[PDB]
Design a protein around this nucleic acid. Structure first.
Ligand SMILES: [Mg+2]
Ligand SMILES: [Mg+2]
Ligand SMILES: [Mg+2]
Ligand SMILES: [Mg+2]
Ligand SMILES: [Mg+2]
Ligand SMILES: [Mg+2]
Ligand SMILES: [Mg+2]
Ligand SMILES: [Mg+2]
Ligand SMILES: [Mg+2]
Ligand SMILES: [Mg+2]
Ligand SMILES: [Mg+2]
Ligand SMILES: [Mg+2]
Ligand SMILES: [Mg+2]
Ligand SMILES: [Mg+2]
Ligand SMILES: [Mg+2]
Ligand SMILES: [Mg+2]
Ligand SMILES: [Mg+2]
Ligand SMILES: [Zn+2]
Lengths: 122, 114, 216, 54, 120
RNA sequence: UUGGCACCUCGAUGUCGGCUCAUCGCAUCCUGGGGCUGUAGUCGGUCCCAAGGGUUGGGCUGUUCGCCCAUUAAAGCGGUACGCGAGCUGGGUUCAGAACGUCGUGAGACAGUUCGGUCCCUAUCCGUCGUGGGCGUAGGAAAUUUGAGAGGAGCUGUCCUUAGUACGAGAGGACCGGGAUGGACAUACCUCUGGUGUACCAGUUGUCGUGCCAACGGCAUAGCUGGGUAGCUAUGUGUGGACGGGAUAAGUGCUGAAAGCAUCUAAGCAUGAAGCCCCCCUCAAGAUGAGAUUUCCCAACUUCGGUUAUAAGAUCCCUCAAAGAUGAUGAGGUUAAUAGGUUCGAGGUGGAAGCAUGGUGACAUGUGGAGCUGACGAAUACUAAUCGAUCGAAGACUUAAU
């Protein structure tokens, strides 16, 4: 349940530290996003000397949310935050590290460098 | 009861293997996942926030902190995917829904054992 | 191409082949009895009356639908069966494979047999245009005085009327609904029950018409 | 919110059909036979309901 | 349940007053809805008087009023005393239905339906 | 659109824009079907048929227009008192206050700008959405019903495979055909996650009270806080728009002359669009053209004509919801489990009161998953649904076949 004007923390080392969403990608009239989905974004806060700086427009993946996801077995997974990881073509990051935990749905989403770098999948 | 027919239909889906636990206590959950290759079994060691529901619709959610990030993994109690449930402590708790832990992290999230 | 009547009891869970959770709906179909076998010769269309929920017999001073009335008791005697509470027809079903007084069972259907359930929806009362038609609420601040009302109605002098299909407040209640392409999970015969995957219409204690799907 | 036309006697009377009140839920009291009463209610006179004074 | 032209707390107090007045008087003239709601209250109280424990006195004091009735021995007594000492001893074989209602007829002022409610 | 004329309105036709609600046209924005190509292929240009569905969120501005950010299959053009102010707002223009520039001797003025500035109405008729009573449908009733008709839905991407194929120097890269999975939308529902949950559970403050301790109660937004049953719900759970048929549109063809040939047409035949009539879903016999089937009920007096209460049946009246503004619909009405209570439970809260024990004490422990528990499941006539009352047929004539 991630929309326009949501600020998401950033779970990589690309330089971005807080990020604001613009449009959710996937189709027309798409109101919200959720884990595994891609978003356009902008950087409202960046770490000094970061690769990705303030006011740069950029895509990203939603990695973890509070409005978590349901699985077919009835198991749910939620979090205590909302987080992004910043990407380009080829569904992989322009950073090199990932912070905190990550969900499994990115496997189905073919975000495999992310899953491999994530210290804990859940 | 719930209903003389509901119960008699959904009896077979139950599980009597499992222990008696309460919200407060640190337990493990040997989940039987199916990763895209094969079946592995990863464990989710955390404290139980809550249990609700009656019958096959019974649930329990567990909370672990991985790397400062709070995780909240909900389950149906009667899954076939839960191969095993181990129990470590029996925490002392004056409530049944420990939602006050979601705002607390560190020394304040400590549950006292009996 | 078959048919069976029941009662919505409620909803439960059940676990599939791979630990897959399944939201399911319980439909009790006991005392199902064919009563009249309509024919193209006499009625002009081939069909099958079906009974449900055996009820009590004639009483001289009866005062409810509990105690069956004398027309109905005769209608069922013609089938050599008990009087019935709910009757409905089934045109899609074949004629030859049913005779009169024959008792239908849940065991006709099978796991995986796909269906469409038809039932009378739950009763919401007099409701407004939002609740009833999904309209939008006007703004709740900024000096508004239009929050939940239906907005405009027509245009003006040209079209100095209100078209018939306009949407206004009214009774949101019990409209007949058919849900399609639902799957039958499991069947219980001691209890004479059918487990149906999904969210079938109407309330508890409520009639349900289960029948095989016309589209496949 | 203001009528343009008066309401004729004809329309007035066509509308004042269903405004009437009905005969109440009246019955006899068998303690006194006459002195009709309301059904499922006590008799004011006999103080009775199923034989017993009240 | 039912709401009686009163908000929640006014309803609670009206119900306690009706219960207590019934316990005192053994019959009262009221409206049918208030009767139909206070019968539940009363009957649960009689059940507590039959269970007869201290905790039951303590739970019935949460619902009764502190009133003083003069007895026919010219004696001072409370509602709760009367209840647990007299009323629960009357009904020791009766399993519920500690109260009846008699629809009387329509009141003049408000067209309300008056009833009589007593604990036979 | 800019305007013209000044025909309706000056004993009032409310005036830009946005909002809510939609509706229509097609000169079609996407999707559909086709022809020509300076169409290799992907993509395109241009025109023809086509109005079924869909046709975005924000920044700036009172703004429409417009520029921009980011998407989308596409981000359509227009009308409807530049649609809609007895449906909203009132930013803007357009009253009175004030100030700047400029004009004016001046009062004051400016399609110049600026700050501020009261948007009345209980709907009679039509109309529309829902809901009932009367009568009628040639006896009176109960149930099931076909369907003259009406309404709805009608969207579309990304991926995989065919196949890295056809094509092409390569870069690149199809149609057709099969499958999968999503966006928006509609619908039903609440087992799941969440919301509410004012007669649920517990904690707690202040003050007053039940004579005091203990325990309880009232007032403080439900005093506040933490959870929450039923129901109501979405943000959640399921489903849907599937597969097809018939006749057509632009077109594409066969045969084939008029006109020895040619020639899709004149006779004739075949094919052909998301479009039309169907298939799908709902309402429907007041369809006065009033349908059909199944079953039930079937006397006595008559002026002879007709009556009469009565049958079946349904109501009054009462207990109640799965229903509900009221009527109505439905469960039931003592040959009774309809509601209340009572006994059991589920779910919820989370360890009562009292007693004892360890402590100076605040407290903690045991008795004891304790006690409480509104709506949900079951059993139980303890209370109330008493006795009763009313309405409701005896089936016209004619013609024909029997
Ligand atoms: Mg307001
Ligand atoms: Mg209060
Ligand atoms: Mg005038
Ligand atoms: Mg006027
Ligand atoms: Mg055209
Ligand atoms: Mg206008
Ligand atoms: Mg106005
Ligand atoms: Mg306006
Ligand atoms: Mg004006
Ligand atoms: Mg001057
Ligand atoms: Mg001017
Ligand atoms: Mg001001
Ligand atoms: Mg729910
Ligand atoms: Mg529930
Ligand atoms: Mg206090
Ligand atoms: Mg005290
Ligand atoms: Mg005071
Ligand atoms: Zn009498």
């Amino acid at each position: 349940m991630i929309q326009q004007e949501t600020r998401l923390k950033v779970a990589d080392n690309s330089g971005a530290r807080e990020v604001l969403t613009i449009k959710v990608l996937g189709g027309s009239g798409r109101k919200t996003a959720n884990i595994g989905d891609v978003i356009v974004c902008t950087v409202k806060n960046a770490t000094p000397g970061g690769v990705v700086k303030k006011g740069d427009v950029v895509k990203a993946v939603i990695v973890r949310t509070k409005s978590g996801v349901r699985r077919n077995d009835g198991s749910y997974i939620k979090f205590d935050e909302n987080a992004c990881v910043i990407i380009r073509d080829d569904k992989g990051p322009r950073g090199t590290r990932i912070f905190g935990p990550v969900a499994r749905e990115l496997r189905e989403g073919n975000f495999m460098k992310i899953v491999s770098l994530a210290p804990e999948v859940l | 009861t719930n209903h003389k027919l509901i119960e008699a239909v959904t009896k077979s889906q139950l599980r009597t293997d499992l222990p008696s636990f309460r919200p407060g206590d640190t337990l493990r959950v040997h989940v039987r996942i199916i990763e895209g290759t094969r079946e592995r079994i990863q464990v989710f060691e955390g404290v139980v926030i809550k249990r609700r529901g009656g019958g096959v619709s019974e649930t329990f959610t567990v909370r672990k902190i991985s790397s400062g990030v709070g995780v909240e993994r909900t389950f149906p109690l009667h899954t076939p995917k839960i191969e095993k449930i181990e129990v470590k402590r029996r925490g002392k708790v004056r409530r049944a829904k420990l939602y006050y832990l979601r705002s607390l992290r560190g020394k304040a999230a400590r549950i006292q054992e009996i | 191409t078959k048919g069976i009547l029941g009662r919505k009891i409620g909803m439960t869970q059940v676990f599939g082949e791979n630990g897959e959770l399944i939201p399911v709906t319980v439909v009790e179909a006991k005392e199902n009895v064919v009563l009249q076998k309509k024919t193209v010769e006499v009625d002009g269309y081939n069909a099958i009356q079906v009974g449900f929920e055996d009820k009590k017999a004639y009483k001289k001073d009866a005062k409810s639908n509990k105690y069956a009335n004398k027309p109905a008791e005769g209608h069922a005697k013609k089938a050599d069966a008990a009087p019935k509470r709910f009757i409905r027809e089934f045109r899609n079903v074949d004629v030859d494979a049913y005779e009169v007084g024959q008792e239908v069972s849940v065991d006709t259907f099978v796991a995986g047999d796909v269906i469409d359930v038809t039932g009378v929806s739950k009763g919401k009362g007099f409701q407004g245009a939002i609740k009833r038609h999904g309209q939008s609420r006007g703004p709740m601040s900024h000096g508004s005085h239009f929050h939940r009302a239906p907005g405009s109605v027509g245009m003006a002098s040209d079209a100095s009327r209100v078209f018939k299909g306009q949407k206004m407040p009214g009774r949101m209640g019990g409209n007949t609904v058919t849900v399609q392409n639902l799957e039958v999970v499991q069947v219980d015969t001691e209890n004479k029950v059918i487990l149906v995957k999904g969210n079938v219409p109407g309330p508890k204690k409520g009639l349900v018409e289960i029948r095989t799907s016309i589209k496949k | 919110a203001v009528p343009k036309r008066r309401t004729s006697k004809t329309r007035k009377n066509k509308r004042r059909t269903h405004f009437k009140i009905s005969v109440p839920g009246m019955t006899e009291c068998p303690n006194c036979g006459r002195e009709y009463k309301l059904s499922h209610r006590v008799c004011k006179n006999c103080g009775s309901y199923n034989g017993e004074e009240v | 349940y039912r709401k009686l032209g009163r908000t929640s707390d006014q309803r609670k107090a009206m119900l306690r007053d009706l219960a207590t007045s019934l316990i005192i008087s053994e019959r009262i003239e009221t409206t049918e809805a208030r009767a139909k709601e206070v019968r539940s209250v009363v009957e649960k109280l009689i059940t507590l008087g039959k269970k007869g424990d201290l905790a039951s006195r303590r739970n019935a004091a949460k619902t009764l009023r502190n009133v003083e009735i003069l007895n026919e021995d010219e004696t001072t007594q409370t509602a709760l005393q009367k209840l647990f000492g007299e009323i629960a001893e009357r009904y020791t074989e009766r399993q519920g239905g500690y109260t009846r209602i008699l629809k009387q007829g329509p009141r003049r002022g408000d067209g309300a339906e008056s009833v009589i409610i007593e604990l036979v």
